[PDB]
Write a protein that binds this DNA or RNA. Structure first.
Ligand SMILES: [Mg+2]
Ligand SMILES: [Mg+2]
Ligand SMILES: [Mg+2]
Ligand SMILES: [Mg+2]
Ligand SMILES: [Mg+2]
Lengths: 197, 141, 110, 117
RNA sequence: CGAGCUGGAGAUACGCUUUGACUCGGGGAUGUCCGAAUGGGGAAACCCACCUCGUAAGAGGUAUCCGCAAGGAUGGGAACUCAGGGAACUGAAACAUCUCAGUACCUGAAGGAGAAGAAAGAGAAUUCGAUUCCGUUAGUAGCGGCGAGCGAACCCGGAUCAGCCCAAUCAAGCCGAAGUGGCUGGAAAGCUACACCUCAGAAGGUGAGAGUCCUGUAGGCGAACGAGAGGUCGUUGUUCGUGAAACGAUGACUGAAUCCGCGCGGACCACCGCGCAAGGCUAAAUACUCCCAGUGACCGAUAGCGCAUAGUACCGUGAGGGAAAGGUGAAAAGAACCCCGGGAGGGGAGUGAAAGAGAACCUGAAACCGUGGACUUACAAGCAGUCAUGGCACCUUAUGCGUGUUAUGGCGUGCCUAUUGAAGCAUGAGCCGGCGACUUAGACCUGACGUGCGAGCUUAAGUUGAAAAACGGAGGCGGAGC
RNA sequence: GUAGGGGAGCGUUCAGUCCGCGGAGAAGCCAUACCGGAAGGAGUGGUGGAGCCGACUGAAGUGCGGAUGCCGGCAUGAGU
């Protein structure tokens, strides 16, 4: 039931996840997300084979202490990496209902605390950003908290090249991470915010 | 500025039971895993084999895989569901998305009522239970 | 060994201009440029000096002591100045030599 | 990601290495040996407590009767005597009393004979 | 493009630069000898000829194979493609089938891609309708000393989507907003006080940590002119290892029809049904990665490629094998001059924030060698310690408890491995440092814990967005057993 | 209490996030009579000359005396 801030003030709408936000599940979430961003890069000649080296050495017996194959194996400096790392993906598909319960339960999080909406920002005017900062002030955004701005509106976002403060974000292509990432959410666009199915 | 590691993206714990630590073979100064001989660095002593009862045991039967019918229990229709319409469709959403195979009707549920079913197949007392309370079992010509 | 590329073998000035050594020692000191080594980011300006001893062995009657020479610097001096203080550069155009472009700060000369 | 052992091992080693002090040669300058010396070291350490207890009561009993017999008794007897007198019940410090206070020790001596025969 | 340039080289000399060098783009001209190498010989880079054009110097031709002729071919390519030829170890706890495999290797041909392709098809609906690739179906059908083990296709989802023809914007590059003072310092981009820019607070550099100093970045501009048939025998392929075993294929013998025609639909027949073989070319989605750019819960010098660069040194007759190696300082300001020495080396002086950075130059552990000091040691039998006490010394977490050292006493059979049993005259090991071993994957099976839904529960491939993730039900698991 | 099973934790790197720290001086090194039930942690001083602790969570080429182990350095035999 959050009161709008720009050009209206409905709010109330939106059932929020019971009981009251659950890290566990927000954890189950975030994690999954990163796993997906986690790229696969394993520089490692794990293979006693992938390394450069001959294949027959000295003499199995009678050379006086030894017993060796090639000079390319786990046990030889410069040999190969036993159980080393090879490329992969660590990407799995987290059940959909959780990705749902995800941000949902994350919005709550933000509502129960420092939530914030906005219907259009004629308060901007061009790119400037200067004035975008302007609004922020009388908008409560001192410049002491990480702000995430979800909303379409090409020209609006164009105002946010300022650090620590805000972090821009298109077509409600939000994300449990970012939101939970920065402090206050500027949910903005009542787009993804009110009306589904 | 006092001191406070803050709660949030960092205050987001696991779940407990959520995920236990792995197992690196070395529990106390005293690990030298696997039996204590006759087994290691390989893999073939499997778990099956063909002499350990497998073989020796008699059989030739004969596999067929004819037709497998979609058992649509009686209580599925009666009890609840106001003749939401069997036909050869709705039943899907009603819940019996088997596709590919036929559709048999069997007598499990029991409450009595009038309902006309269009199963692709049905049993004796299957039919002899429907009409016997209203409704018509309908098999393909 | 990378070397003076971080910038772009581009000396924001000429080996003749005057400049103020902002930063480092010799801050504000000024002098005419003499050597403009773009690649290495070396600048020889009458400002900073040094007294070096010439290694002149069997150099036809040695008598080598300690010369006074200028020791080059980097981007530790801000090219050209007119308000008497360091100054960026921006408002160009052309002269009766439209065959060229100038530069300038708050003001407009160089 | 790679994960050296760096600094993690030097330290583990210095720990032991520094436990060995007046450990003779190698035993106090070489890891392996120094360390190894400390296993046998375990054996002695632990078992020596459960044991100096054994050693000390021995020092006590030895003196308690080189005074006991200094009058005409002897530990064996003497002890059962003070015993015969629930009254008496030191045993602990008894030796010392017999080593420092002869004035006293005599007392207890004769006290027993006077509860003996 | 505008002050510099005169390659790495760290040097001197000579010089060259707005009648704009240099450098960057983009076309030309030169391009000895060898190498397919091709004038002929040849043990590569050499040795010898000839004809023609000619001032001689010097120019050019002189190879084989296809074609009148132009013109094409020979060679070389990391991997990918097809083709001709095609292992064994190994498994099956032995082994001959079978497995490993048509993999490895050899060879031929080719391109940037190939291969395949427009139906005598697959399928059981009188359906689909070239080929190829991903998902699934399914580890189902089936093959199998019916052992080990091997393993389809249709349907359905998705990438992409054509059939046509014969014969009778990326590179050069240019423009590009916004700060000062004071303080700490050897030096500030740090602190502090006020100020500015922000479609450019990506990033690197500057004497330490940079939005506003430099290079850049968002955004804008941006070129002459530069890119984009049947059969029989022998065999074989597909799950097809002879089996009832079809069809495809071909070495050997044979040898047909043609619409009231021909092939097939797993021996075979009729009936029913799908398709028309013996000519051809064909985008696209597919593969790989020498080369390039970007990125990385990748490495960061025993790591990472073998190479912080070297396939070099070095080893081999040869095929071949094959190293290690990083770090002055912010900047050379790299040490003038004096002392000892032939020198090497060092001590002063001087530079520098620092030489408690000096060029056998960041840190500088350990083994190992040594100097000085403290407490000890020349009747003693010792795994080398440990407990106890006394002596001596010292007392920055420490004079009241201790720290160090030591004398005498008691007690006391290294460690690991392998073992019924180890001090063991049983194994291993000179000492230290660093490297060094139960992992990774499969929509696989099975269980514990936890989360979300819940009698229902899920997506895979791909799709579109991505400093984000939604879409995508083909399909799978519960749901009836025997 | 050996093989084995079960439980709770220490530490190392890398990553996300929080609080920060640093040229009047980081990491690493070196010394120490403190702290914790252990793995281990801290304080102080010296060295050092630039990056770095603590906390929550995530991923690991994650922990060594043995392998006639591997590479390197230095010892013994011996001034023989
Ligand atoms: Mg390697
Ligand atoms: Mg190093
Ligand atoms: Mg190289
Ligand atoms: Mg033996
Ligand atoms: Mg060792």
């Amino acid at each position: 039931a959050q009161i709008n801030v720009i050009g209206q003030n409905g709010g109330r709408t939106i059932e929020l996840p019971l009981p009251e936000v659950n890290s566990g599940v927000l954890h189950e979430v975030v994690t999954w997300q990163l796993a997906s961003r986690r790229r696969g890069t394993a520089s490692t000649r794990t293979r006693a084979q992938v390394s450069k080296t001959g294949r027959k050495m000295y003499g199995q017996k009678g050379t006086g202490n030894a017993r060796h194959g090639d000079r390319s194996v786990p046990t030889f400096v410069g040999g190969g990496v036993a159980f080393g790392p090879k490329p992969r993906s660590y990407d799995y598909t987290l059940p959909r209902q959780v990705r749902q319960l995800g941000l949902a339960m994350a919005i709550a999080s933000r509502q129960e605390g420092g939530k914030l909406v906005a219907v259009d920002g004629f308060d901007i005017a061009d790119a400037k950003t200067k004035n975008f900062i302007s609004w922020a002030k009388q908008n409560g955004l001192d410049g002491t908290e990480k702000v995430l701005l979800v909303t379409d509106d090409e020209n609006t976002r164009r105002a946010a090249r300022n650090v620590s403060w805000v972090s821009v974000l298109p077509v409600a292509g939000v994300n449990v991470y970012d939101i939970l990432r920065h402090d206050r959410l500027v949910i903005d666009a009542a787009a993804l915010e009110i009306v589904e199915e | 500025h006092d001191l406070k590691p803050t709660p949030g993206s960092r205050k987001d714990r696991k779940r407990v039971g959520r995920g236990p630590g792995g197992t690196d073979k070395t529990a106390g100064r005293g690990h030298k895993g696997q039996k204590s001989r006759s087994g290691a660095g390989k893999g073939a002593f499997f778990e099956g084999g063909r002499s350990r009862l497998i073989a020796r045991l008699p059989k030739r039967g004969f596999n067929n895989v004819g037709t497998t019918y979609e058992v649509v229990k009686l209580s599925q229709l009666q009890d609840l569901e106001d003749t939401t319409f069997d036909r050869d469709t709705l039943e899907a959403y009603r819940l019996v998305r088997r596709k590919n195979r036929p559709v048999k009707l069997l007598a499990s549920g029991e409450i009595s009522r009038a309902v006309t079913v269009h199963v692709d197949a049905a049993s004796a007392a299957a039919i002899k239970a429907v009409e016997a309370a209203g409704g018509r079992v309908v098999l393909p010509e | 060994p990378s070397a003076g590329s971080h910038h772009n073998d581009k000396l924001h000035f000429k080996k003749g201009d005057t400049v103020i050594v902002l930063s480092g020692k010799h801050k504000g000191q000024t002098g005419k440029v003499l050597l403009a080594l773009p690649r290495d980011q070396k600048v020889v300006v009458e400002g900073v000096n040094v007294i070096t001893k010439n290694v002149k062995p069997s150099m036809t009657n040695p008598q080598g002591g300690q010369e006074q020479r200028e020791l080059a610097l980097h981007a530790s001096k801000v090219a050209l100045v007119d308000p008497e203080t360091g100054k960026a550069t921006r408002v160009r155009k052309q002269i009766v030599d439209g065959k060229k472009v100038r530069v300038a700060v708050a003001s407009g000369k160089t | 990601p790679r994960a050296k052992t760096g600094i993690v091992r030097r330290r583990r080693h210095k720990k032991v290495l520094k436990r060995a002090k007046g450990f003779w040669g190698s035993r106090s300058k070489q890891y392996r040996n120094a360390f190894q010396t400390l296993l046998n070291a375990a054996t002695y350490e632990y078992r020596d407590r459960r044991n100096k207890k054994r050693d000390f009561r021995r020092l006590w009993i030895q003196r308690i009767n080189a005074g006991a017999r200094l009058h005409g008794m002897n530990y064996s007897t003497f002890i059962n005597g003070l015993k015969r007198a629930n009254i008496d019940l030191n045993r602990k410090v008894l030796a010392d009393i017999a080593a420092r206070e002869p004035e006293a020790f005599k007392a207890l001596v004769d006290a027993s004979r006077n509860a003996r025969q």
